[PDB]
Ligand SMILES: *Cc1c(COP(=O)(O)O)cnc(C)c1O
């Protein structure tokens with residue numbers, strides 16, 4: 001049987017050889033990996049989860065195990081609306097909540113609901129790889145905007161929007177991981193958040209704010225989600241239980257205008273019918289009964305030291321010519337090497353010295369920048385982080401000699 | 404803000420006004436609903452689920468709560484391969500297993516992976532509404548084939564395939580809910596299953612066998628899944644825990660040739676990253692430790708009486724001119740009224756008399772047959788079923804008078 005002849009056009013394109021190649025290197029024996037994107041299992045509130053699971057099965061079995069609505073388990077959606085309104089002072093008048101099988105599904109749904117081939121969509125450069133993967137399927141025109149210490153360069157965005165306007169072109173969506181960005185670790189300043197919203201009205205586009213780390217600030221001044229400043233529904237906010245509960249439940253939520261939620265709901269129905277109800281019932285109690293609020297500080301207390309250890313090790317071992325972001329939360333740090341260095345090609349040399357990272361090329365729509373890398377500090381203890389950074393520094397010193 | 408201007412072409416099309424209209428009628432006060440498609444909560448093995456959940460959280464917390472692979476939790480996939488091989492004597496050489504967020508996701512993935520606009524796909528007439536919904540998004544050309552007491556009319560399929568061949572057209576996929584069909588309740592005979600496979604080789608197409616009720620036969624002679632006769636990978640088998648464990652976990656699985664699984668895996672990654680791991684770990688123990696095999700007989704024992712009550716009530720109260728299928732398992736029965744009767748229009752009259760059903764028009768790609776309906780017997784007790792059928796019979800007697 002020739003199976004290839006059955007595949008659709010989009011299926012013929014998609015492939016994952018490069019992710020397999022990277023996994024092969026990262027999993028090599030005797031390698032300290034700083035290339036992961038996973039939360040630390042020590043942060044999973046297992047005892048709390050066990051207690052709630054039992055509670056749900058004893059008092060809410062039928063609703064927790066039966067098919068649910070596509071929009072999502074109402075008690076959870078209501079608890080999330082209340083929690084968000086309170087924690088971020090979000091104007092809720094034009095806000096409705098729907099749950100999704102992880103924020104990832106929201107990304108795919110945003111693609112289905114808003115993107116026609118060729119539609120211009122703005123993403124940061126670099127940006128979340130899974131977002132690029134989700135949107136690319138819909139073949140939009142990717143417009144990338146650089147970042148700096150204060151996140152997306154909204155000044156450059158405005159210039160690009162004007163240029164596009166003059167070309168009779170329009171941007172439908174501006175996608176931003178506004179706080180503790182994956183992969184850069186930078187955070188959009190409040191002044192830029194307000195400006196982005198102004199631009200959204202001026203150039204009439206919608207903002208997709210991915211907020212997976214909104215609850216994980218370890219230091220610096222709080223930066224309210226862009227959604228907090230949204231009074232009309234210009235922002236589609238994506239939250240997730242992945243980093244504040246556990247990735248396993250595959251439960252995320254979308255806070256947006258009813259008109260958008262209804263469309264996303266219709267699109268979701270044919271994809272998976274509903275988000276898993278058992279996990280939703282558990283998340284319901286987790287949020288409504290105060291467990292989430294009690295656990296967040298514990299997560300911060302666990303990650304902060306690892307964040308500090310990585311920044312301290314970089315300062316201690318990295319040679320001159322190397323720069324890195326200073327994340328005030330989240331799980332990632334971006335390291336930038338001198339121009340001319342290809343961190344993808346240097347990978348095997350890093351692995352040879354016992355360390356792994358994610359070559360930065362992948363986080364760029366066109367994979368045009370090659371001297372950066374993403375490091376992770378959540379998954380490994382402080383000493384391992386230091387040893388890992390030490391090995392990476394030697395790798396870099398040697399790479400710098402090549403040319 | 405004019406949100407409509409942002410919606411994609413496909414988003415502009417999709418809508419759910421008719422499902423809302425039906426839900427409105429079904430939920431009317433004082434109505435016995437035979438229009439549901441849900442398993443009975445009494446069949447959920449709650450105590451077993453509670454025990455396994457605790458076990459998983461005490462002994463496998465990290466793997467049950469952390470992000471999983473897109474292909475699926477290996478211990479579960481291996482247990483499913485073993486269980487299937489044993490229970491259905493499936494030739495496993497060219498079979499690999501991947502888990503999905505319910506079989507529904509498999510349907511969407513099959514659409515993404517195999518269907519280009521205009522591609523001919525065969526479905527039974529009637530067929531599973533959610534399947535039509537999943538495939539339609541990909542705009543294929545629906546080719547429908549009638550059913551009879553022994554399922555899909557494979558003789559008619561062959562004639563249609565020949566006609567298409569002569570037209571230079573080819574069918575990529577033949578989708579069939581081979582056992583205890585939703586909505587008809589009929590089952591494809593073993594002779595037709597073997598013939599369908601022969602045709603798959605002769606006309607070179609792939610078979611998607613949806614087997615949500617493969618484990619729920621209450622009477623009659625066992626009919627092995629079409630997959631049991633597949634030695635080369637012509638069949639993509641879809642199983643689900645929805646009717647044998649609980650719909651809430653949103654865990655289904657796909658048993659197919661590695662080449663197809665790999666493509667589906669790539670497509671799934673950008674949709675939701677992975678199926679929820681917590682539910683997968685629970686399903687793993689449920690299957691591997693023998694719970695599933697012990698529970699199946701209990702489900703059969705619970706549903707069989709309800710199946711019998713509905714068939715007995717139809718025979719007792721239905722007027723001459725009314726026919727219905729005699730399901731040997733599953734959850735549905737198809738009732739056919741005299742030509743000229745529109746069960747969609749009769750709906751409000753049925754609701755007025757205290758009973759609801761699903762007008763059959765929806766289960767047809769073009770919604771061209773209007774004298775049928777789908778009844779469900781799993782969700783309500785025997786006496787309620789009889790009272791419901793009694794009210795439906797009076798509704799029909801009166802409808803027959805109209806013209
Ligand atoms: C961690 C993360 C997510 C979460 O994805 P889920 O599908 O909810 O697990 C989303 N966006 C970014 C930027 C992340 O790094």
Ligand SMILES: *Cc1c(COP(=O)(O)O)cnc(C)c1O
Pocket residue numbers: 272273504505506507508531580584585613615642643644645646650654655
């Ligand atoms: C019940 C049913 C399913 C199961 O769907 P899930 O997404 O696994 O819950 C699939 N196909 C048909 C024909 C069914 O009636």
